[PDB]
Amino acid sequence: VNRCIFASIVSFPCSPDAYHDDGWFICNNHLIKRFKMSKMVLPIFDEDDNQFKMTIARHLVGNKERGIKRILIPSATNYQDVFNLNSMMQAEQLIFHLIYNNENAVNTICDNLKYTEGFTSNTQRVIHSVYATTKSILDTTNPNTFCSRVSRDELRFFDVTNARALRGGAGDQLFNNYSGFLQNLIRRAVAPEYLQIDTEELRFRNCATCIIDETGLVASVPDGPELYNPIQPNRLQIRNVLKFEGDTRELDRTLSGYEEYPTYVPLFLGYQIINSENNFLRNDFIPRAN
Amino acid sequence: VNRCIFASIVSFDACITYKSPCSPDAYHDDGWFICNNHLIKRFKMSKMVLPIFDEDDNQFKMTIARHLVGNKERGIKRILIPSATNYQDVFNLNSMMQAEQLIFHLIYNNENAVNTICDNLKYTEGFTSNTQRVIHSVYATTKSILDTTNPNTFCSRVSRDELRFFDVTNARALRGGAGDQLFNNYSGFLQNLIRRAVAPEYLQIDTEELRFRNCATCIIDETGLVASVPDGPELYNPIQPNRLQIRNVLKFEGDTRELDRTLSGYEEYPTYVPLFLGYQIINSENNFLRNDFIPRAN
Amino acid sequence: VNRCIFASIVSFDACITYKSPCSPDAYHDDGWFICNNHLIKRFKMSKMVLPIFDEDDNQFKMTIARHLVGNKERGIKRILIPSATNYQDVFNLNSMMQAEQLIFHLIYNNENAVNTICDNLKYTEGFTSNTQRVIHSVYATTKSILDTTNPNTFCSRVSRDELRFFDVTNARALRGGAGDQLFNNYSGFLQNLIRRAVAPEYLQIDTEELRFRNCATCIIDETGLVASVPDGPELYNPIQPNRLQIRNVLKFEGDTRELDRTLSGYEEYPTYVPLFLGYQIINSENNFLRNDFIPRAN
Amino acid sequence: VNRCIFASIVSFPCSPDAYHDDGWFICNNHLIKRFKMSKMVLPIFDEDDNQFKMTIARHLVGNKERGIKRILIPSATNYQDVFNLNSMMQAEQLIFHLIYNNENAVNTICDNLKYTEGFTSNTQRVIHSVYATTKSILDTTNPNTFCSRVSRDELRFFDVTNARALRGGAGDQLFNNYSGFLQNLIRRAVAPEYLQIDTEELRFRNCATCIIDETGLVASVPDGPELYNPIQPNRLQIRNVLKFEGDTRELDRTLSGYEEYPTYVPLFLGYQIINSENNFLRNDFIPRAN
Ligand SMILES: [Zn+2]
Ligand SMILES: [Zn+2]
Ligand SMILES: [Zn+2]
Ligand SMILES: [Zn+2]
């Protein structure tokens, strides 16, 4: 079973990791294509060799990109401007409008395709199949379902100012406006800076690599210049690549043996407070709301 | 496929291995979305087709329901499909299975009672492991049936070919009455159940006005779909192991053997009491004969 | 027979069959009324036997428990058998099974909580059949164990031959103390669990004092049976799937092979920390030699 | 299994119907011996052949009996005077003091037996077996048990003045002071004067034969003279016995064929409302509180 929200794209490409029950409910191909992230894992090791894996995503925005180009997951207000939904297929636009709980756009999409000659046969069935798959995925990721296995186990705050007091900041209250699928995506992509398992607090990164804003999940550092992240057949595009001119074969041969530390920029932000009584090690992917 | 709205009824928590007791007609895609057994048990009706012949031999058949309420029944016992306000009083949902209660609360779009049903089973230990799967399967099946029936879904394949008004005093002017506006308060599934159960007195096809019955055998009121005639006494309609209920039947004592043999060779006219009410105007551009069950709205 | 108070554990929902994780030693009629594994899980201890030899070889063996709490644990984690006031906070009864909640609410005589436990399950459909019997069986077994332990039973074998005090300030005068008055507040099962798990500092068979240990390893306080020493730092005591909990494991990095091989055939003094507290006066007309369990009230 | 309250009688006599699961929880032999009643079945016959059987008792007090001799099930206040518990076995006294919730008498019974030499050896095990059996039976018949299966489908009132409504009289109020076992005994013995299944009131008897007043359930007619009911070793009992001086042989010869209407005096009193939703045909023997 392809557990990808974008696996239902069909005229009116999923990586093999979509079939895995990772909990993202989106394939790495579609994550790269749409949300400018590639799924990774964060192996949290003991001082012994026992480990458990957490899912993180490395954003793929550049150093020079500014403005809406830095938004990873836009808010419901500005997701129209960020994504340019007109270019993508109408099924993709329906999926995106369902993801952001925009009912007016969904109704307009349904109304526009009602006037076509083929709507009655072999089209309405397809649109309803896409709608049903997207709605099932949303309900799986939505904690407000009829009988939802919501978890108060882990308290994931996206502001660390008052997080230790179990409170939240402005970014946390802006995070609640997101839908179930978007909240799950931000939880599975934006790793916590601190992981307060019971009393023990584990600081994974010194500073946050992303900030939740009114524009959405912004891949912008809180201060200073942005980090260096080096990354439609008929479309013409300009990349302005920062080419490195020089002979590096000798240097690469010299330093071959040593382990390579990745230059990726992962998403670390917020505070995670895992309660003493937890069921963290389950792979059923229950909604796990705050 | 078992397209029975009550086929999802299973024991929510107990592992009693309960099975849905509905006939093979559940598998048939007649547009009823309910069995004759389930209709008999709950809505006090039995599904029936109505052969509407031409003046030639060729025929097209319409669905109808034979209401089962007796002559002596009165008060809340006369209602077949209760309204959303008093469906709890009529049905006595407490005595039924929790799956049945959830299905009925979904049928009447009672979100508070559905949430209460979910909450009451949150405390049991089986909810985390097994009960949640069963409850969510029941919810998914019931919601799929409702959405297939509901004309206000995301992309609803609705048809305005026929204009079924349940008040005939002004339906000739293409305007319904108070009963029709009361009929709109019902959910989609109840609307389809009433349309498949209650047949019109007049089946107006283009200019033709085919009056099926003299007067109505059922009336839609704020109380619900009442199986009571508009005037006079009610029509004579002949009719849980641990329960002790009293029927007070009306039994003859005659021989009824030689008389039965005397006229047995002649075709018997059925004595059932089907539901007849409404004015189903049919447009000249109709698509009535198609059997894909397109949900219908007025 | 499996005379373990948690041997009656079972899933109330018949869909899941939960076997009791009960040690083989539970079937013994020692007088613990709790298995080794269950006392390891809750009331953190390991059931031990304390052989009190005579001056010659012949001996009588007593029962004592070793608290499994660590050196670093402080506050609530120190409590092994909590008081009836804060047993809900200490045990986190929400995460435990409903049978465990029932047993623990009966152990502390919290009638309101037990009534709540059956009130929550009274709503589900499965309560009437295959679950009422299960809950009643669990209640009957727990009540039988408690009544066997309860000295206030109808005709109980209450024995005053051995007096067990938990305050040693004035225990020689057969007088109790603050801890003993708190000990009387516990139910019968908790009193027997503490008596079988805690041994006196000063055994006083007849007029012969027998000081078991110099200083107490446990204290009975308002919080409950605390595994905290009277003064100074706590004693060094080395020590649920799908649950992620930190451990703070202390590890030894030495080779230890040569040192271990050096002392080959020398009897190993245990590092376990048993519960020693109180002053168990024994009367000249005692019947301690018996093997039939008795409540043993003051 | 011998589901009889007095089956556990043993020094410190049950009919075969005790083994039957009837809900009486007392055999006919012990009913006659103690409560001056005998078990009977009242077959409630439908107009067509479909019958359900209802339990009933026939009191065995005579025409001339008066005072405490007319009391079938005495109240908790005066059951000592009626039963003369001193003559009975100590096990019988313990059973009766448990049945009437007299904890002080039970404790005194335990205290009297404590001083005996053999109390600890074997006698206490016997007394605890008796106590356990009696208490299990009481809890089975007690609607106020821990979380037993109490049913309110049947509303049985012993005062028909206002029993047509949900209210009750003083006789029903005095009936609540009874213990669980005595309540079940009266429910299974005192058949209703009226049975109302789904607003269909069936009058089994014109006028009552017993009254639940103070001093317990009394086998006395509400008005007029008493009805005519004809009914330990080495004990001299002088009882007045009626006698018919006639031959009474040819008269019995002539009237042989016809069915006999028994001269039994059954117990009919009160109004039993039965709800439309009920499980009256079950055999699980729920306590059936009002
Ligand atoms: Zn995909
Ligand atoms: Zn069915
Ligand atoms: Zn055990
Ligand atoms: Zn008997």
UniProtKB/Swiss-Prot annotation, chains A, D:
Keyword ATP-binding: no
Keyword vocabulary terms for this entry: Capsid protein, Late protein, Virion
Top-level taxon of the source organism: Viruses
Cross-referenced InterPro entries: Baculo_VP39
Subcellular localization(s) per the UniProt record: Virion
Keyword Transferase listed: no
An annotated GO cellular component: host cell nuclear matrix
A Pfam match: Baculo_VP39
GO MF annotations, alphabetized: structural molecule activity
Family to which the UniProt record says this protein belongs: Belongs to the baculoviridae major capsid protein family.
Note: Expressed late in infection.
Protein purpose: Most abundant structural protein of the nucleocapsid produced during the infection cycle. The monomers are arranged in stacked rings around the nucleoprotein core.
Designated name of the protein: Major capsid protein
